[PDB]
Amino acid sequence: ISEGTTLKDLIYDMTTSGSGSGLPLLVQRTIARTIVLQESIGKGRFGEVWRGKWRGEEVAVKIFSSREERSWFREAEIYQTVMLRHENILGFIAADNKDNGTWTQLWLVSDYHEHGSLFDYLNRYTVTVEGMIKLALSTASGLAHLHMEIGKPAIAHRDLKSKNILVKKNGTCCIADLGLAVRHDSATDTIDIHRVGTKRYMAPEVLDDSINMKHFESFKRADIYAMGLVFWEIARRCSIGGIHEDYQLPYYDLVPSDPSVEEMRKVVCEQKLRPNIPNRWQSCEALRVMAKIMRECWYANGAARLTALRIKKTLSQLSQQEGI
Amino acid sequence: ISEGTTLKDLIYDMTTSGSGSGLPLLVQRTIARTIVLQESIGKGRFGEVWRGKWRGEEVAVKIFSSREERSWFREAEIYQTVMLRHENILGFIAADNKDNGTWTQLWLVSDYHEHGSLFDYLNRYTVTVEGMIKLALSTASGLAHLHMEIVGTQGKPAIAHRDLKSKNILVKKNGTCCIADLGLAVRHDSATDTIDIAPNHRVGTKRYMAPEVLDDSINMKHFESFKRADIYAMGLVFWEIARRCSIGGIHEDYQLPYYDLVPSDPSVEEMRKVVCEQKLRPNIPNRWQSCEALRVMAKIMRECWYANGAARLTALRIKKTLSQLSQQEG
Amino acid sequence: ISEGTTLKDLIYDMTTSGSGSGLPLLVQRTIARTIVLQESIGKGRFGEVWRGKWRGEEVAVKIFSSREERSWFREAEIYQTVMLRHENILGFIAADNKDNGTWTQLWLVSDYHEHGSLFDYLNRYTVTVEGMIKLALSTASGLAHLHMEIVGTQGKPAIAHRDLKSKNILVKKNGTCCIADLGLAVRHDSATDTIDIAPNHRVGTKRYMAPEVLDDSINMKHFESFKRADIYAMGLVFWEIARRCSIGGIHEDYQLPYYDLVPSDPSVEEMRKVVCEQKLRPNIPNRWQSCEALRVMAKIMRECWYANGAARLTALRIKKTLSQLSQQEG
Amino acid sequence: ISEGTTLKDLIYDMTTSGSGSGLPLLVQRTIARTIVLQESIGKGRFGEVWRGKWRGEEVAVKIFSSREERSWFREAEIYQTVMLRHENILGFIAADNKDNGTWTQLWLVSDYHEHGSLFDYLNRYTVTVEGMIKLALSTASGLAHLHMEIVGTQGKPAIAHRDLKSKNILVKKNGTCCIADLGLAVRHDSATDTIDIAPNHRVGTKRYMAPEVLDDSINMKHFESFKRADIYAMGLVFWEIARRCSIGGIHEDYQLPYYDLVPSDPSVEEMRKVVCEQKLRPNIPNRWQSCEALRVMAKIMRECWYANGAARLTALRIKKTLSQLSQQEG
Amino acid sequence: ISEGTTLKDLIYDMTTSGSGSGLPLLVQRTIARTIVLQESIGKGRFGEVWRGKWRGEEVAVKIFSSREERSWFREAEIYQTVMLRHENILGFIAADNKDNGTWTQLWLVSDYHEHGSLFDYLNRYTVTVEGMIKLALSTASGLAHLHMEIVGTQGKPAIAHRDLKSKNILVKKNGTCCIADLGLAVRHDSATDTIDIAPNHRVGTKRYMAPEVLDDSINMKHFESFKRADIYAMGLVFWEIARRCSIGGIHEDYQLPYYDLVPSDPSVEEMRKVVCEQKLRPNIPNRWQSCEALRVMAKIMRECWYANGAARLTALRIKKTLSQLSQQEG
């Protein structure tokens, strides 16, 4: 990387001429080992996420704990091997490793989004009907692209939630955290594979353990159910005429912080309960369309739920009718 | 192979790659020299098979004796060269070598199947009529794929095993099989009508040698001769299988073919007298007329044991009729 | 580069090179580090431009200040990665770097034009009606080529200059022009609908900044916004040109646009008031109604100065109508 | 060439490869420098031919004399560059060099044929009418392939042997032949109408030199001239063959062409008088009118011995009519 | 280059497969630095031409004077950059350089023609009517090929010699010719209408300079101007040739064009007066009306000497009509 080169230049180059594939390993290494960390931004099972700068420009750095090397590799593997680039998917920049044994240092580098996670964004703000559409549409667009097979294999996130989604300056979203993701090669009907993910968003089939992990579709479906819970968190903060609910996680009133697999299973599987869809949401077209989707996402039977592409389509429709 | 990489990842990548080729030699080397052997699993002419682990995940390692280098190369050659790969064929992972002269260490690495060889499996168990079909069908499917020629790029030449037997077959968790040990295998390039033979003379376990092979009347100029000998032995294997097919508590004790007509470790001559001269074959039990399945099987076995090779069934044939019998079950 | 090689040879080879490539980095380096500087020719935000010689032949060398490395890279980047080669665009020859840290030396090498910038040229001369057309036509031709997008191997993305002006234009021996200084240029990949300089402020010479740019109402999300700002400034340039078009001894003295409505080195605010608020434009002399040429030009200038960018003429448009006028006289 | 690799494996791989090409220089070197010579097999202008073994398997090694480097290169060049491989052409395996100056050691390696040259074979045996056909057909097939030009990448230029004779032909286990010794061979690129040599001389075994060659009236500007001379000699060879075709115990003793009209090691002049002047040819025995085969052969021989080259049969022609005679009785 | 390699082999390879117009630089270097000079053959502005041998085989070596590096490069550049290889153009083999500064040694290597230049050849001999045709036809063929433009990548640009004369033409063993010395040659890329010029002032031997060149009225903006000047000189050459065409013992003594109207080593001015002013041309002998051949030639010469270039015949034209006459004899 010569003098004057900027992050933008790099990204632009892989994005255009790059031909699906990303920066050269040597370049990734150089970027990584030449970044300057600012401060921490968040944690997780993996490790910590930091806000860093590369030659002035901001960037996000996920630093893994030596004992979490599998997550580091898995996620980098899915990004690079697949050449999975998309407006609504956290933009991968580089991967790198540094020490030996116990002190091995594993990093991943991506675009930086000052707004943080959708979770933080919704706790900090309320949103326009237009704003709500932007967020939901983008999120659906991304999940649609992940599930879509092309080229690239189909991918199931396996851990969707407001905290794994980031919001850009332009009020759009991008899925993030592919550490638990699963791939499906149709041409071989194989899936490099154990219930994982945040309990609060686990789908019904997943909770009672009735899910068939032999059919890749099972995973795509569980993704939709959670994406529905996310749309719920969003619409809740869609303020029309000063009226809006306070930010709340799904099932915030039916189960304790840090729900157990059992606590969740009782409310979701047994009691067959779902987040409460407010009455006022019948107000405008938008709120209705959304409420509609949410229901067609929460079905106990997965094969009955809507598909990501489906939601992207109908949500894309509601958007043109809004002149967005 | 970087941190966090798992065996699954590796396999997945070669599997879902543009080339039917396998892992890069450097990767094979690294895997090999980084495996951790557990304990022995079995022996043979080649050397020993061990159960090993690579970063925790289990794997099988065939360690050859320096003096058996030809078998090591031959088998690795057949696997890599033609991107052989099939559900019913032991999955090759890597090959590697280590020392010099006398102490050269030759290894081969493949998938691990906790059940061991069909031989061990039958000695340890008895099986369902359905179970018996699974085993025979799968075995036939594999031998079919080996014998099958596919002209073109990602195609493969026809291959004759030359040493089939319950001990060279492995059984998976799902009660399926996969042929193994291609050290004596022979290739046939139709487009050149050329047959390559590393061990040109008679080879293989005496007990399963076909008639043409025993009296030495076989024409090793016609590749077909080899495919046929394979069938005869596959017949003996089906015999060992059906014998343990317990229907209503009734079943025979495990027994190798010709267990009553010849001593352990039969000589080429002892075998030739019973098979060629006396024209004897394993005894097909009377009760095997009981159900459809047992009959179909007994049928095949006979159409496999013909003294005249050209008269025997083909692997694809057996795969077909056995695939049929399967359809009407479960 | 071997003995006897001349600059001409090099240029001819890349030019005539079927494969749309410029010179090999190693050759660029050698040329650069083997040039012999003569003396300074001009300055700017970037650094200084020098007239130098490579094995006798003249050439221009833009030497950047260490602290201006981004401009150096940006400009070289746009030239090389795109193949951008055009009769009416300063001809790029090579780029190179030399020291470390504080004393890093960044160079760029191009064709040498003894006439200098259009600015110097107009201050030194007056011009024929034919002369005026040559200059305006060529300039338009170049801006047209920059803005033009082409999908294909030897194709190029669309590019917006973002800092057009008489001082960034050079005039050749044959009275033609060529745009120069692509340090602020922006690229647009249609097939991805993506920009180059993603987060940008307001750049360029204040005096020529377009209205949308001055009040900051410009939409930097639509690439077109930039093309339009380029036209507005190109209009101011045509103005500087026509002003020196002497027909029968009558002609105005050279003057920069808005020379009478704002101080030397105008501030963003001083300019915004005169251009945005007072809605003023350079004064289009009365005599310019004299001949066809002067009228065509005055016409364009107005259709370039519109407050609303989407209302302005396009580069290709001006190139066409100006090509016509130049056609009405040989 | 790892452990366990065998010659067969190597040959099989190059053979069954769409590359149509041969072994990597590094592999050739390794084979060459790792071969173990057994003993001498024959001599010639070039040097000596030895029977050697590579890891047990037999192979032939032609060791040239330092002063004969041109023959070494020339032959290896024609084999490798051209990608020349054919059932009826000695199979090239490798080429290598070793010392410096005076003691430079130049080697060539090929398949080994225990039967030796046709010359030795005919001196040691007599042959069936069928046998005679096999030999003549194969030889023609090879010469046909050499002379044949092919435009595709799997194709090659036309080649003239320039030194055909029973001593340069080898006989395989299956009673077939293969031309050998391409040290004097000439190439013809039709697409450029160019030759591979400086025919500035006269080469080859005197005894088989064609008429045009002897009197020196041959036009070495027309590649055809060479093909024709090849046919004349191939005729002399068919003569040596038919002579030993024993039908009912009756057959002549092996004899070289012109054995009765000129001394051992004939001079260019001695030969020219008998062939050019006296216009003599080998005597075609009366009994050869006995059967069809002998007649067909005698026919060819005459249509090969014409004084005028352009009048002689072509290799493909002979291959065709000889292929006919053959197919009438497998 | 390994043992046994011969010059022929090298040439054949580049001629045939070698995609790059010619041999690999490393091979060129080796050849050059391994040649053995015999003795001098001639001089010129460039330097000296020597007869040398590479591994015995003869070859020509043009050794340039350090101060003439531009000619060395220019000529090598024109040869290599285009694959320019034609029967009637001196065959390029290699280029190489050796020392530093003042003692830099620049070489060029080509085929050797024992006959030397047409100039020497005509001074040493007289020629047949057939012989004369051979020489004129060949020369025209070559100049035709140089002037001819071919658009594919397997094509080339049009080239003007700019210094044709009996001393820059060589005669082969077969009485044919080949143009030589492309040091002043000029290239024309039609697809860009660019005239790659070496020295942009009048160059070449005064005695053969065309009229337009002498008075300096030539338009060096139109590539055609150069092709035309080439024809005028080629006409003077045909004159020098016919002069030595002896029919029945009658023939003139060798003489350079304008040998009687101007001093040895004519000045630009001396020539201009006789050619431009006095409008004089070489005297076309009366006897040349004798036979068809001599007339055809005299015809051409006149249609080559026109004061107006655009009026002269084209190389292809002359090649055609001369090719016709050639066929009217055999």
Keyphrases for this structure?
324 residues, alpha+beta, Phosphorylase Kinase, domain 1, Transferase(Phosphotransferase), domain 1, two-stranded antiparallel sheet, globular
N- and C-termini, Cα separation of chain A: 39 Å
**Sequence of strands across the biggest β-sheet of chain A:** 1-2-3-5-4
Oligomeric state of this protein: homopentamer
What is the CATH level 1 assignment of the largest domain in chain A? Answer: Mainly Alpha
Work out the count of structural domains of chain A.
Answer: 2
H/E order of the elements of chain A?
HHEEEHEEHHEEEEHHHHH
Give the overall form of chain A. globular
The rounded Rg of chain A comes to 20 Å
**Roughly what percent helix of chain A?**
25-40%
| Share in β-strands of chain A | 5-15%
How many strand segments of chain A? 9
The secondary-structure class of chain A comes to alpha+beta
Major sheet characteristics of chain A: 5 strands, antiparallel
Explain the overall architecture.
Chain A: GO terms for molecular function: activin binding; activin receptor activity, type I; ATP binding; I-SMAD binding; metal ion binding; protein kinase activity; protein serine/threonine kinase activity; SMAD binding. Chain A: Residues 1-324 are cytoplasmic. Chain A: The modification Phosphoserine is found at residues 17, 19, 21. 5 copies of one chain form a homopentamer. Chain A has a 5-stranded antiparallel β-sheet. In chain A, strands 6-9 form a two-stranded antiparallel sheet. With 324 residues, chain A is an alpha+beta fold. In chain A, helix 5 runs antiparallel to helix 10 (308-320). The longest helix of chain A has 20 residues, at 216-235. In chain A, strand 4 (92-97) and strand 5 form a beta hairpin. The first copy, chain A, has 2 domains: 1-114, Phosphorylase Kinase, domain 1 (2-Layer Sandwich), CATH 3.30.200.20; 115-323, Transferase(Phosphotransferase) domain 1 (Transferase(Phosphotransferase), domain 1, Orthogonal Bundle), CATH 1.10.510.10. Helices cover 37% and strands 15% of the residues of chain A. The first copy, chain A, is globular. Chain A has 10 helices and 9 strands. Chains in contact: A-B, A-C, B-D, C-E, D-E.
